[PDB]
Amino acid sequence: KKLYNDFAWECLRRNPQYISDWELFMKNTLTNGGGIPSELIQSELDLNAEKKWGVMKYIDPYNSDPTNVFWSLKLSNRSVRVKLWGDMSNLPGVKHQRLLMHDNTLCVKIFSQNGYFQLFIXXXXXXXXXXXXXXXXXXXXXXXXXXKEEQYLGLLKTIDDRKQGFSHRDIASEIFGKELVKNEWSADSWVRAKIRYRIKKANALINYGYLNFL
Amino acid sequence: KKLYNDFAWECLRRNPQYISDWELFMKNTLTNGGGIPSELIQSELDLNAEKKWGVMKYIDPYNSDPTNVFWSLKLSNRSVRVKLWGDMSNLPGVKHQRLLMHDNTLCVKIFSQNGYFQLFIXXXXXXXXXXXXXXXXXXXXXXXXXXKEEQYLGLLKTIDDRKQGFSHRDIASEIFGKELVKNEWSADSWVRAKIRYRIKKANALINYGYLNFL
Amino acid sequence: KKLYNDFAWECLRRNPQYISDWELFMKNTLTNGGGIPSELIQSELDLNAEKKWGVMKYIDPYNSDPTNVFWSLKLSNRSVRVKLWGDMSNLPGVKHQRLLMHDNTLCVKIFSQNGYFQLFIXXXXXXXXXXXXXXXXXXXXXXXXXXKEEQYLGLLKTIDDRKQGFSHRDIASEIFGKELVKNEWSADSWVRAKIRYRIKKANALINYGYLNFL
Amino acid sequence: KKLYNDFAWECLRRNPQYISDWELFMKNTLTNGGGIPSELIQSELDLNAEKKWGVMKYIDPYNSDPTNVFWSLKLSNRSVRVKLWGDMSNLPGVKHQRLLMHDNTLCVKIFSQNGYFQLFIXXXXXXXXXXXXXXXXXXXXXXXXXXKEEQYLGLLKTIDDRKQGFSHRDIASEIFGKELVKNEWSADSWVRAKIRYRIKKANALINYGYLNFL
Amino acid sequence: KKLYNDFAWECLRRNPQYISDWELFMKNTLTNGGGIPSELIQSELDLNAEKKWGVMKYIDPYNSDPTNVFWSLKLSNRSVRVKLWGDMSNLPGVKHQRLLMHDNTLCVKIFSQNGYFQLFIXXXXXXXXXXXXXXXXXXXXXXXXXXKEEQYLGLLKTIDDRKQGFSHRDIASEIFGKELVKNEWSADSWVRAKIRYRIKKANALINYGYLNFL
Amino acid sequence: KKLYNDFAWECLRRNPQYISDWELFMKNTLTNGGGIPSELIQSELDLNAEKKWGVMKYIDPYNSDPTNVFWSLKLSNRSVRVKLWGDMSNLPGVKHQRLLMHDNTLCVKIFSQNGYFQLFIXXXXXXXXXXXXXXXXXXXXXXXXXXKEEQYLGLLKTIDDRKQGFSHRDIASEIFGKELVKNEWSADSWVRAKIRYRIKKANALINYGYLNFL
């Protein structure tokens, strides 16, 4: 089952350029390569996506489950470097997924219903010694996992409506009602401007604005 | 003096389309209209900018002081409707600016060194009665004014470097050093990918991503 | 069943002048008026009681259940003005009662086991904008309802003992014991002074002192 | 100078029966007794006032300074029994006053700008051992002294206006304005009912309602 | 069953001099006295142990249950003087034990799974009146009972290993492993110094260092 | 000036065996070695003291200033391993001292008026990743330094009195008074037992009991 929701992945998988990239990645691996890309191994093609989109591995954009969605250490604010486990990784209600990277570094994601956290490899982590710093909030976030976004997802729903063929007025009627739209829709109307603002907000998130959520 | 910094305004005033819009707005008002646009009155041309960019009045993009930068009620999460003052508006260290809107509604912004807050017109405000809701956080934000963003501004600094003519490698040397760049710059290098990610992050903020900060 | 206890009503319904007023109100409505006064409608006679005693409707003083006991907006510190619900009014454990006032204003009381709260008419309330004010405590009190007084009720129990015909010494024996009273009762004895202080405390509450508890 | 304000004393000294009692107490001590009643010693006449009014010593009702106003142990919720000091009693900003009682018990009041506290006689106090009890709040109140009431005093101001000869309408004009009163004053008017409610509230406090504030 | 663990008793009952004292106390009472020492009565011989070891009664050092282990008022930081109960002493999960002392003072210990507390004789206790003092922490500790030490007990386990005949190297192998000890054991080795430090730490606790834990 | 007080050092420097060890260490270095032991370098003789007493360097027991008193990593609960500073080490009111160890590891002590903290070598520290662990309290203790013990020092004062030649009765008179001692001193007296308990408590601290305070 889908444990958690990755909002940045919901933005990225709706990017038309990423969808085109993934379909190209599938075609050259199914008809020009070794075949189908559980045992996650980052290839060279996947590292191109990490340097371009942020995900360490090309993930099917049709699937909302972010189990195999790993975010680059160069971008993630929910990752730590760990040196050398069974206690943290086997709580009834906490799952984990592993990924072997191109530089032979092992990334393990710890996730539950409250989010995810990535560990790049007892368990010891080198925390930067900065007095009165919010760098310790990473440990608090990991504890919350082992223990506006509803409006943001509604913006992505509007993008799904557009790509289905619905017009701005169609989406306006869906949100405000047929009677309100017939009475107020105009050239410089505020109902039209609100729907346009929904598109602009979501487009900015989809066109790499999701990077600011990592 | 510049009391506070409006991060959304720092994004918007760097938008090339908004800069072009403002220069067009100045030309048709200086050579085709009544002349120069302290006594802020929202005209019809200003309301077009409110429905397009979010600011209730065209503001010179060259000035960082957000004194006369007013944000639309349709977008602002720092605004309330107030019905009918001298105590709140005259604290030593708290300033205020007024704007008369096209619909004859008066908007008064209360700001200090900790941010701004807009009041749309004793003083009584109709707060929505929702049990266990964060709608009361608006009153807490107003109290904080009457009593990552350093990284976000650094992203906009990179946009200023680009518009000046500096290349991606030039900006990479500015941040990481000439020696590191000469050794590591390549086609699919991570230093080049980091600089590209800076541009993408800032571009998303500039291209209406600032709306998610209102 | 009796959900909560209104201490101010316990004081008022023990007032001999109010009891006489209610019996007069019943006689002129049962033998001179339309008959018996679930569908609470404030008449002109009830508004006389609101301007005299504080309750918006004459309530039988023999009943301790304060379901239909409504307190005047001119006196209540547990009331708000609300403009235009099913979520707040239908929690398993929270009841409500309505009253239509003489000025056609609808008062709805929301009560549970932790107290009551009155709303005078989504749901929006005009809260006075006063910085660093305890006016927001009304919302906290309403949240506590939707989520010394044992000594004060003992004082009213002493009034019930007096109206039954028990003397001050009888009540002293009831509280301190027959042996203590026989040994210590005197003209200027402290046991007699304590019982007198009980009466004075309760009489002050009954003779409009309950108004300070609204 | 007057350090603090005793609200219960402000109620009691406005009681006409207490004022008559004090004037009788002065006459029988100035023309029938030893003369004038700094060295506070509770006599037999003072103990009659303690059993009747609550103050351990007859105090001039014309003086608002509650320095020599001591409240009976039988009524005070701000008193403790102490067994056997210079550290607590000599803080720059904390004063103290002593009273020798008729039963040879010494009462010492510790007061500052935040209130008063009475000690009835190192310093050790026998606190009742009750689990999860608010009896320890007496120590917190004493710490606050060594470290609605503005509306209540306004009610007593209305009593001062009445005893000066001002009518209910005069006081209504003082609070609401001459124009409002001339327009709204009537037989069953709400402006008249509000002023009547002020009197009733204050009268209840004055007629032994202050006992509930000790 | 054993409700709680008294760490000071775990130190004292491992003291060789106390074990010798108890065996002498048993011999002179079983072959020279009245016989066997539920009804705890402190004799003169027991008071010698109170002035020497701290326990008000000689307790068999072989038993870890500290039910009858009472600590002297001259040493205990978990004791109060109480003057004159059924509510506190009969919570489902809270037990109590009584001891009659040589000076006819009754000591009652209240204990549960969270520790013990001793009362030396309603229930009233004379608390010292000291402003901003931690003397009130005794009431908080008693409330916690009515509602490093795992490392310290491991130090006493090392003493048990020594008295059984195990050498320092034997205990080193028990803690660090046979392979580590064979490789690192030397004259001035750190593994030998760590085991020596364990002994010194525990010996200090056993040789009256437990007094600092009362 | 002496910034802070090291209680464990106050115990250790009063140890007669350590004082003898230090005098032997001085004699073999002043008449058999290189001479006098600001530039702290741990020699082989100093490491013998680290494995025996805990201090990384022999310190003159006559000096109470614990500036050059360093505690072994094998014993200190106020030390961390740090990998590679000017911000933390140069606060107006925070000093630091360095020591080069026999294994070429550099130990730097950061201390102020609130205590000391040792760092064994930006600045990064490998913190053990244990969920719901008190290992993070080391960072809180370091923050407190960069931002019963009065009774324990009184116990060491009693040891100073003994080594000066004062008897147990002399110390009893010093604490309780000449009159109390002359009246109560006996064979099995409690005043004599209290003084004996002071000695036993302090002796346990001095004879390696200080290790439990590191």
Author numbering:
A (entry chain A), B (entry chain A), C (entry chain A), D (entry chain A), E (entry chain A), F (entry chain A): 3 to 39, 42 to 88, 100 to 136, 145 to 170, 181 to 247
Article, verbatim:
To gain a better insight into the structure and function of this novel DNA-binding protein, we determined its crystal structure to 2.3 Å resolution. RovC consists of two distinct domains. The C-terminal domain (181–247, pink) is formed by five α-helices which fold into a helix-turn-helix motif, as predicted. The N-terminal domain comprises amino acids 1–136 (orange) and a central region (gray). One extended basic patch (formed by a RovC dimer) was identified on the outer surface of the ring mainly formed by residues 225–240 present on the helix-turn-helix motif which is likely to be involved in the interaction with the negatively charged DNA backbone. DNA binding assays further revealed that the R225E and R202E substitution completely abolished the DNA-binding activity of RovC, while the DNA-binding activity of the inducing K175E mutant remained unaffected.
The type VI secretion system (T6SS) is a complex, versatile multiprotein nanomachine, which is dedicated to the delivery of toxic effectors into prokaryotic and eukaryotic cells. It folds into a novel hexameric structure with surface-exposed DNA-binding sites, which directly interact with an extended sequence in the T6SS4 promoter region.
